[PDB]
Amino acid sequence: MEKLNFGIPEWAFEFHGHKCPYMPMGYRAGSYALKIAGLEKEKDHRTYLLSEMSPEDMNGCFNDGAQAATGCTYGKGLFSLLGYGKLALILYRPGRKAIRVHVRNSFMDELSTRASDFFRYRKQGYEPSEIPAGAIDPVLEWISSLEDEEIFEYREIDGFTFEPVKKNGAKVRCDVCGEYTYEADAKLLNGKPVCKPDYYG
Amino acid sequence: MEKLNFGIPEWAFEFHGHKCPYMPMGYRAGSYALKIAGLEKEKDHRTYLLSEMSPEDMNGCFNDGAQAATGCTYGKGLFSLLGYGKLALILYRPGRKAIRVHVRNSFMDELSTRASDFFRYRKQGYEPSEIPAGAIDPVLEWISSLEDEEIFEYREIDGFTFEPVKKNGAKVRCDVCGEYTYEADAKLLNGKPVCKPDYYG
Ligand SMILES: [Zn+2]
Ligand SMILES: [Zn+2]
Ligand SMILES: [Zn+2]
Ligand SMILES: [Zn+2]
Ligand SMILES: [Zn+2]
Ligand SMILES: [Zn+2]
Ligand SMILES: [Zn+2]
Ligand SMILES: [Zn+2]
Ligand SMILES: [Zn+2]
Ligand SMILES: [Zn+2]
């Protein structure tokens, strides 16, 4: 698709399912990383995107936006988390210096004020779909009015290296349940391929 | 957005970036899991989706489709991989029996024949965007012509339990670099919060 809501494609909101400040921020961050790199969105498996967040962080919606803006998705094996707890992305394409993008602390301080209504709802436990548009639309409008430079900082990293997980497409029927199992995940039980649930159980 | 290409929303293809058989299969699987469960797409953080694939499996594009169909995304903390190497999903909403959906081996055998052109290109190393439409469009048309029952099997699991990762939104300025760091990922160095890169380096 192709049409914008608060400067973010409408499709990105349909993927994510709701309006919140972090998915747009992640989208903006991913777009900015590409602009800096002089790259277009990734259609295939060439460029890597690493988020500095961890699974324990709230606001992981940032990662949906980042994947959405760059085409470096978790499913394609191009998106991963480093676990540092920072609102930052590292775009890396082998043979080039990686680009790190960080959301400014000063932007975060202003977002806390600007989006206090939205965050008060979230603190009480209301899911984003239950939050009134008046509490979120002005925040997204504000974010869309800012230049990339007002939200983010960046730098090139010199010695960055990253080797992704080695992938394998071969499959074999599990000896116990009969289901096709990717060889990479099959266990051997007396010379026969067995899926993990049947091996360990 | 809202318009279909081969029975899959056009937006899902823009997110993923290219045409391949597995993203649509994952989309179909996720949609079927919801239909069986009697649930609508997840706008927020209520339902969990677990893929039985691992990061070492080729065809992880299945996972983009699954997230896209269900609204159970990796960014929202609702999507995870179990690492069994099966083309299967488990939809789970606390207080109900989980639903497991498996892509039939027989469907996989027919896909190998039906999509031999596409897979020959992939075996040579051509990325999906470089593959001619004639090698992929008839495969997607075929998939759209099949009923859910022709592609998948399902079952309810009785004793399924899953506790997601405990999340925390609090942040503190790292004592060394000054960057806001989610407390959940901060290290303590003589009573001061330090981000992992500054702690370990
Ligand atoms: Zn969100
Ligand atoms: Zn910074
Ligand atoms: Zn107010
Ligand atoms: Zn609620
Ligand atoms: Zn098995
Ligand atoms: Zn794909
Ligand atoms: Zn089966
Ligand atoms: Zn041919
Ligand atoms: Zn190529
Ligand atoms: Zn630090």
Author numbering:
A (entry chain A), B (entry chain A): 1 to 201
Paper text:
Molecular replacement was then used to determine the structure of the I222 crystal form at 1.87 Å resolution. The final model includes one protein molecule (residues 1–201), one unknown ligand (UNL), five Zn atoms, six ethylene glycol molecules, eight acetate ions and 129 water molecules in the asymmetric unit. All three crystal forms show zinc binding at the same two sites, suggesting that these sites are functionally relevant (note that two of the three crystal forms, C2 and P42212, are devoid of exogenous zinc in the crystallization conditions). The I222 crystal form also showed four additional zinc-binding sites, which are likely to be attributable to the presence of zinc acetate in the crystallization experiments. In Q9HJ63_THEAC the zinc-binding site on the NTD is situated on a loop connecting the N-terminal α-helices (α1 and α2). The UNL is only 1.8 Å from the S atom of the conserved Cys61, which is consistent with a thioester bond between the protein and the UNL. Two significant structural differences between Q9HJ63_THEAC and Q2LQ23_SYNAS involve their metal binding. First, zinc is bound to the putative active site on the NTD of Q9HJ63_THEAC, but is absent from the NTD of Q2LQ23_SYNAS. Second, whereas the structure of the CTD of Q2LQ23_SYNAS shows four Cys side chains within coordination distance of the Zn atom, the structure of Q9HJ63_THEAC is atypical for a treble-cleft zinc finger in that three Cys side chains and an Asp side chain are within coordination distance of the zinc. A FATCAT search of the PDB shows that the structure of the zinc-finger CTD on Q9HJ63_THEAC is similar to the individual treble-clef zinc-finger subdomains of several eukaryotic LIM-like proteins.
